[PDB]
Amino acid sequence: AQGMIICNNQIDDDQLKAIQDLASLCREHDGGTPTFYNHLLIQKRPTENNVLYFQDNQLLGFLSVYFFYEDACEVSLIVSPLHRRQGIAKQLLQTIMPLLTAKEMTTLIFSTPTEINDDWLINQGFSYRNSEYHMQRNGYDPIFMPTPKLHIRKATEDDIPALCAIDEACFPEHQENMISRFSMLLNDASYTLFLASYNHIIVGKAHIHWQSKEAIFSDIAIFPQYQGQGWGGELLSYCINQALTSGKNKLMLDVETSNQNALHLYTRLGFKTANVSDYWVIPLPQLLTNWAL
Numbered sequence: 001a002q003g004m005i006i007c008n009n010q011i012d013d014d015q016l017k018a019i020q021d022l023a024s025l026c027r028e029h030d031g032g033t034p035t036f037y038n039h040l041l042i043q044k045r046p047t048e049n050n051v052l053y054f055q056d057n058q059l060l061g062f063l064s065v066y067f068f069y070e071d072a073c074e075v076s077l078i079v080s081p082l083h084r085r086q087g088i089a090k091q092l093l094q095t096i097m098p099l100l101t102a103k104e105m106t107t108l109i110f111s112t113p114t115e116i117n118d119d120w121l122i123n124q125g126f127s128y129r130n131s132e133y134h135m136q137r138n139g140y141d142p143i144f145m146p147t148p149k150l151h152i153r154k155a156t157e158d159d160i161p162a163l164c165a166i167d168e169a170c171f172p173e174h175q176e177n178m179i180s181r182f183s184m185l186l187n188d189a190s191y192t193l194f195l196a197s198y199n200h201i202i203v204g205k206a207h208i209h210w211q212s213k214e215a216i217f218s219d220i221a222i223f224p225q226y227q228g229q230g231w232g233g234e235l236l237s238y239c240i241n242q243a244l245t246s247g248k249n250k251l252m253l254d255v256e257t258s259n260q261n262a263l264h265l266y267t268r269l270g271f272k273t274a275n276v277s278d279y280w281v282i283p284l285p286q287l288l289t290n291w292a293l
């Protein structure tokens with residue numbers, strides 16, 4: 001008999017592959033997994049945010065907290081489907097709550113696989129917020145496009161006013177960091193900000209972040225006034241074919257949404273939903289009375 005609880009501030013390489021093996025076992029049974037931020041896990045973070053639960057040399061539970069907002073934190077938590085309703089989740093949370101009360105936390109955000117937990121979550125005071133589709137296009141075949149009607153080019157530092165017009169109309173979350181954020185993106189060769197123009201009028205954009213064997217798509221936008229014309233599909237088509245020409249076949253795209261109709265164009269250019277996570281909110285004091293402290 002042996003139980004062991006490790007609480008640290010950085011996931012080492014072998015711990016990471018134990019965590020990924022446990023997560024894959026949960027994907028086997030749950031149809032999906034919570035959202036993990038691997039770059040944050042393997043980073044030396046200021047506090048002890050990771051909790052690993054072992055039983056006879058076996059990783060059975062894992063929790064990590066991410067401090068994104070001010071009074072809110074995101075929690076990714078998994079327990080071996082073969083060892084559930086044994087209190088492993090309350091043990092992991094008991095471990096982390098001293099850190100949470102010290103940071104003055106008031107609200108917890110849990111990422112969860114869809115459907116399977118809906119009824120007991122809502123019956124315990126959790127509130128659904130949104131969902132996230134982690135998409136991948138893995139085919140080697142390019143997109144065969146009709147007559148191109150857009151001119152598409154890499155944005156230089158001289159397209160900032162157009163980039164800021166696009167952001168103002170589509171990405172209000174960057175309002176007051178926008179010029180300085182663009183100045184760094186445009187002077188980083190691992191980022192390509194594609195500008196789409198129809199008859200010399202700029203109609204939208206899309207970002208590609210190049211990695212050594214992947215390409216990460218983000219910040220796709222067509223102005224609402226221009227969204228009927230087929231330009232969103234042409235722009236994204238062009239970016240896909242650019243990544244394939246560049247020798248990257250793992251194309252990533254993450255979409256936060258509460259309705260699946262925001263997936264129509266992407267799935268139709270060959271992206272598929274590799275994982276879906278739901279995000280539920282609960283007041284911290286309510287969680288520690290429904291779960292014994």
Ligand SMILES: *SCCNC(=O)CCNC(=O)[C@H](O)C(C)(C)COP(=O)(O)OP(=O)(O)OC[C@H]1O[C@@H](n2cnc3c(N)ncnc32)[C@H](O)[C@@H]1OP(=O)(O)O
Pocket residue numbers: 169170171220221222223224226227228229230231232233234261262263264265266
């Ligand atoms: S201020 C602008 C804010 N930006 C966003 O919210 C970013 C995400 N969406 C977009 O930038 C545009 O909605 C995209 C997805 C690029 C579509 O632009 P377009 O409307 O120009 O693209 P097409 O005309 O080529 O495509 C029409 C086809 O696909 C589905 N569609 C509409 N809206 C979406 C969204 N939001 N997500 C996925 N698919 C979407 C449609 O089926 C639309 O086709 P129909 O002919 O309308 O059936």
Ligand SMILES: CC(C)(COP(=O)(O)OP(=O)(O)OC[C@H]1O[C@@H](n2cnc3c(N)ncnc32)[C@H](O)[C@@H]1OP(=O)(O)O)[C@@H](O)C(=O)NCCC(=O)NCCS
Pocket residue numbers: 026030034077078079080083084085086087088089090091110111112113117120290291
């Ligand atoms: C829930 C999970 C995260 C931990 O489960 P666990 O170790 O089985 O949790 P516990 O045994 O600590 O039980 C704690 C509270 O679970 C709630 N809970 C867990 N599973 C539940 C279920 N299937 N139905 C109702 N409540 C459940 C209860 O309040 C349980 O309380 P009780 O048994 O004392 O009444 C596990 O089901 C899992 O890893 N699921 C997949 C990942 C996921 O959904 N993460 C999101 C968590 S919000």
